[PDB]
Amino acid sequence: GSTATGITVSGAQSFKPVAWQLDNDGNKVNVDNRFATVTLSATTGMKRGDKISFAGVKFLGQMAKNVLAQDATFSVVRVVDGTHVEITPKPVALDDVSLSPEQRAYANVNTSLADAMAVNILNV
């Protein structure tokens, strides 16, 4: 035991990675592109190379077949503040109209991290 976390998100966040075509966003600096810095209530007990899942956030295509579709499985790279982690790749929602068409191709998850998502480490 002592593997399950079940901690809740602290705020809603949706970051977008810089695409090949910098048409909509021509951000010159390369930061927070492939990594996603997750702001959660608590992220203590997590370590680099661990498995965290976001309840409700999952990949496009899963729900079309898997009724009990697994949640977004991302690998943590570093626990920054112990209430703030950096994972990769970065979760981007296809349902989010805030992004440009190009970004929709890069979109991997259905929904962005809203302020009520549970973050649980999978035991394996």
Side-chain angles (χ1 to χ4, degrees), residues 87-106:
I87 60 177
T88 193
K90 180 193 295 299
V92 276
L94 190 278
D95 282 281
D96 183 18
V97 298
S98 310
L99 43 63
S100 190
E102 301 70 78
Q103 304 295 150
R104 309 183 62 103
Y106 298 86

mmCIF file of all heavy atoms in Angstrom, residues 87-106:
data_model
loop_
_atom_site.group_PDB
_atom_site.id
_atom_site.type_symbol
_atom_site.label_atom_id
_atom_site.label_comp_id
_atom_site.label_asym_id
_atom_site.label_seq_id
_atom_site.Cartn_x
_atom_site.Cartn_y
_atom_site.Cartn_z
ATOM 1 N N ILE A 87 5.248 17.301 -15.377
ATOM 2 C CA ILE A 87 5.068 16.047 -16.096
ATOM 3 C C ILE A 87 5.315 16.244 -17.581
ATOM 4 O O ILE A 87 5.468 17.368 -18.048
ATOM 5 C CB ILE A 87 3.641 15.485 -15.918
ATOM 6 C CG1 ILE A 87 2.608 16.481 -16.459
ATOM 7 C CG2 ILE A 87 3.365 15.170 -14.459
ATOM 8 C CD1 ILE A 87 1.182 15.988 -16.389
ATOM 9 N N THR A 88 5.361 15.148 -18.313
ATOM 10 C CA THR A 88 5.436 15.205 -19.759
ATOM 11 C C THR A 88 4.867 13.911 -20.343
ATOM 12 O O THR A 88 5.001 12.845 -19.733
ATOM 13 C CB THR A 88 6.889 15.441 -20.245
ATOM 14 O OG1 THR A 88 6.897 15.781 -21.636
ATOM 15 C CG2 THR A 88 7.766 14.218 -20.015
ATOM 16 N N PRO A 89 4.189 13.972 -21.502
ATOM 17 C CA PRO A 89 3.925 15.217 -22.241
ATOM 18 C C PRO A 89 2.889 16.113 -21.555
ATOM 19 O O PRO A 89 2.369 15.787 -20.488
ATOM 20 C CB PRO A 89 3.382 14.730 -23.595
ATOM 21 C CG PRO A 89 3.657 13.264 -23.632
ATOM 22 C CD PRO A 89 3.636 12.813 -22.206
ATOM 23 N N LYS A 90 2.609 17.250 -22.179
ATOM 24 C CA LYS A 90 1.656 18.213 -21.643
ATOM 25 C C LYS A 90 0.236 17.877 -22.099
ATOM 26 O O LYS A 90 -0.010 17.711 -23.295
ATOM 27 C CB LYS A 90 2.026 19.628 -22.103
ATOM 28 C CG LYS A 90 1.077 20.706 -21.596
ATOM 29 C CD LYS A 90 1.282 22.027 -22.323
ATOM 30 C CE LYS A 90 2.653 22.632 -22.059
ATOM 31 N NZ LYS A 90 2.867 22.940 -20.619
ATOM 32 N N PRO A 91 -0.710 17.759 -21.154
ATOM 33 C CA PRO A 91 -2.117 17.504 -21.474
ATOM 34 C C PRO A 91 -2.790 18.708 -22.133
ATOM 35 O O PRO A 91 -2.823 19.804 -21.570
ATOM 36 C CB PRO A 91 -2.751 17.213 -20.111
ATOM 37 C CG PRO A 91 -1.869 17.892 -19.124
ATOM 38 C CD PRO A 91 -0.480 17.843 -19.700
ATOM 39 N N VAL A 92 -3.312 18.494 -23.330
ATOM 40 C CA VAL A 92 -4.021 19.531 -24.065
ATOM 41 C C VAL A 92 -5.357 19.012 -24.577
ATOM 42 O O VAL A 92 -5.422 17.955 -25.212
ATOM 43 C CB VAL A 92 -3.191 20.073 -25.243
ATOM 44 C CG1 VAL A 92 -2.233 21.148 -24.762
ATOM 45 C CG2 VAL A 92 -2.420 18.951 -25.908
ATOM 46 N N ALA A 93 -6.416 19.755 -24.289
ATOM 47 C CA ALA A 93 -7.771 19.324 -24.605
ATOM 48 C C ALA A 93 -8.174 19.692 -26.026
ATOM 49 O O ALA A 93 -7.878 20.782 -26.512
ATOM 50 C CB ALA A 93 -8.752 19.935 -23.620
ATOM 51 N N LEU A 94 -8.858 18.760 -26.678
ATOM 52 C CA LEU A 94 -9.374 18.968 -28.026
ATOM 53 C C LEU A 94 -10.677 19.764 -27.969
ATOM 54 O O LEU A 94 -11.028 20.477 -28.908
ATOM 55 C CB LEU A 94 -9.584 17.601 -28.702
ATOM 56 C CG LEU A 94 -9.889 17.597 -30.211
ATOM 57 C CD1 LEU A 94 -11.361 17.860 -30.486
ATOM 58 C CD2 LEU A 94 -9.028 18.617 -30.938
ATOM 59 N N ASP A 95 -11.383 19.643 -26.851
ATOM 60 C CA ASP A 95 -12.652 20.342 -26.664
ATOM 61 C C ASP A 95 -12.435 21.809 -26.326
ATOM 62 O O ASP A 95 -13.380 22.597 -26.319
ATOM 63 C CB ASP A 95 -13.483 19.686 -25.558
ATOM 64 C CG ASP A 95 -14.168 18.416 -26.011
ATOM 65 O OD1 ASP A 95 -15.220 18.508 -26.679
ATOM 66 O OD2 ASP A 95 -13.670 17.315 -25.692
ATOM 67 N N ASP A 96 -11.195 22.175 -26.043
ATOM 68 C CA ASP A 96 -10.887 23.547 -25.672
ATOM 69 C C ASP A 96 -10.726 24.407 -26.916
ATOM 70 O O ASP A 96 -9.820 24.197 -27.717
ATOM 71 C CB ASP A 96 -9.623 23.618 -24.816
ATOM 72 C CG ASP A 96 -9.320 25.033 -24.358
ATOM 73 O OD1 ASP A 96 -10.233 25.888 -24.408
ATOM 74 O OD2 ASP A 96 -8.176 25.295 -23.929
ATOM 75 N N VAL A 97 -11.612 25.378 -27.067
ATOM 76 C CA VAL A 97 -11.604 26.252 -28.233
ATOM 77 C C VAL A 97 -10.597 27.390 -28.077
ATOM 78 O O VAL A 97 -10.459 28.228 -28.966
ATOM 79 C CB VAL A 97 -13.001 26.855 -28.494
ATOM 80 C CG1 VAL A 97 -14.013 25.759 -28.789
ATOM 81 C CG2 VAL A 97 -13.450 27.698 -27.309
ATOM 82 N N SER A 98 -9.897 27.417 -26.950
ATOM 83 C CA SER A 98 -8.947 28.487 -26.668
ATOM 84 C C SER A 98 -7.708 28.379 -27.553
ATOM 85 O O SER A 98 -6.978 29.354 -27.730
ATOM 86 C CB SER A 98 -8.541 28.452 -25.195
ATOM 87 O OG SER A 98 -9.684 28.395 -24.359
ATOM 88 N N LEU A 99 -7.479 27.201 -28.117
ATOM 89 C CA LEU A 99 -6.300 26.973 -28.939
ATOM 90 C C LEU A 99 -6.593 27.178 -30.427
ATOM 91 O O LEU A 99 -7.749 27.309 -30.837
ATOM 92 C CB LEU A 99 -5.726 25.568 -28.683
ATOM 93 C CG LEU A 99 -6.737 24.414 -28.572
ATOM 94 C CD1 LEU A 99 -7.509 24.222 -29.865
ATOM 95 C CD2 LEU A 99 -6.030 23.122 -28.197
ATOM 96 N N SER A 100 -5.531 27.218 -31.218
ATOM 97 C CA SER A 100 -5.639 27.358 -32.663
ATOM 98 C C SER A 100 -5.789 25.980 -33.310
ATOM 99 O O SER A 100 -5.335 24.994 -32.734
ATOM 100 C CB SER A 100 -4.385 28.069 -33.196
ATOM 101 O OG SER A 100 -4.519 28.442 -34.558
ATOM 102 N N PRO A 101 -6.445 25.880 -34.486
ATOM 103 C CA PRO A 101 -6.643 24.607 -35.198
ATOM 104 C C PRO A 101 -5.413 23.688 -35.178
ATOM 105 O O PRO A 101 -5.530 22.488 -34.913
ATOM 106 C CB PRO A 101 -6.951 25.069 -36.618
ATOM 107 C CG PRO A 101 -7.673 26.357 -36.435
ATOM 108 C CD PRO A 101 -7.075 27.004 -35.209
ATOM 109 N N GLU A 102 -4.242 24.263 -35.438
ATOM 110 C CA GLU A 102 -2.980 23.517 -35.413
ATOM 111 C C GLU A 102 -2.835 22.737 -34.106
ATOM 112 O O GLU A 102 -2.501 21.552 -34.104
ATOM 113 C CB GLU A 102 -1.774 24.460 -35.563
ATOM 114 C CG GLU A 102 -1.766 25.294 -36.839
ATOM 115 C CD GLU A 102 -2.829 26.370 -36.848
ATOM 116 O OE1 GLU A 102 -2.632 27.417 -36.194
ATOM 117 O OE2 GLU A 102 -3.880 26.162 -37.485
ATOM 118 N N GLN A 103 -3.128 23.409 -33.002
ATOM 119 C CA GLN A 103 -2.975 22.834 -31.673
ATOM 120 C C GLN A 103 -3.923 21.658 -31.466
ATOM 121 O O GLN A 103 -3.655 20.782 -30.649
ATOM 122 C CB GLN A 103 -3.251 23.890 -30.609
ATOM 123 C CG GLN A 103 -2.383 25.134 -30.724
ATOM 124 C CD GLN A 103 -0.910 24.861 -30.493
ATOM 125 O OE1 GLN A 103 -0.053 25.538 -31.056
ATOM 126 N NE2 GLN A 103 -0.603 23.879 -29.657
ATOM 127 N N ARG A 104 -5.028 21.647 -32.203
ATOM 128 C CA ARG A 104 -6.009 20.575 -32.093
ATOM 129 C C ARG A 104 -5.412 19.254 -32.561
ATOM 130 O O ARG A 104 -5.778 18.186 -32.072
ATOM 131 C CB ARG A 104 -7.245 20.904 -32.921
ATOM 132 C CG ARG A 104 -7.806 22.280 -32.628
ATOM 133 C CD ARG A 104 -9.069 22.551 -33.421
ATOM 134 N NE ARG A 104 -10.136 21.620 -33.070
ATOM 135 C CZ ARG A 104 -11.169 21.929 -32.285
ATOM 136 N NH1 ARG A 104 -11.272 23.144 -31.757
ATOM 137 N NH2 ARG A 104 -12.096 21.019 -32.025
ATOM 138 N N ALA A 105 -4.492 19.338 -33.513
ATOM 139 C CA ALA A 105 -3.777 18.162 -33.987
ATOM 140 C C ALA A 105 -2.845 17.634 -32.901
ATOM 141 O O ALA A 105 -2.635 16.428 -32.774
ATOM 142 C CB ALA A 105 -2.990 18.493 -35.245
ATOM 143 N N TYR A 106 -2.306 18.553 -32.109
ATOM 144 C CA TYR A 106 -1.394 18.198 -31.027
ATOM 145 C C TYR A 106 -2.159 17.835 -29.757
ATOM 146 O O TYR A 106 -1.571 17.343 -28.794
ATOM 147 C CB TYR A 106 -0.435 19.352 -30.726
ATOM 148 C CG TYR A 106 0.461 19.742 -31.882
ATOM 149 C CD1 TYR A 106 0.027 20.643 -32.844
ATOM 150 C CD2 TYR A 106 1.741 19.217 -32.006
ATOM 151 C CE1 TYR A 106 0.840 21.013 -33.896
ATOM 152 C CE2 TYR A 106 2.561 19.582 -33.058
ATOM 153 C CZ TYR A 106 2.106 20.480 -34.000
ATOM 154 O OH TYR A 106 2.920 20.854 -35.043
#
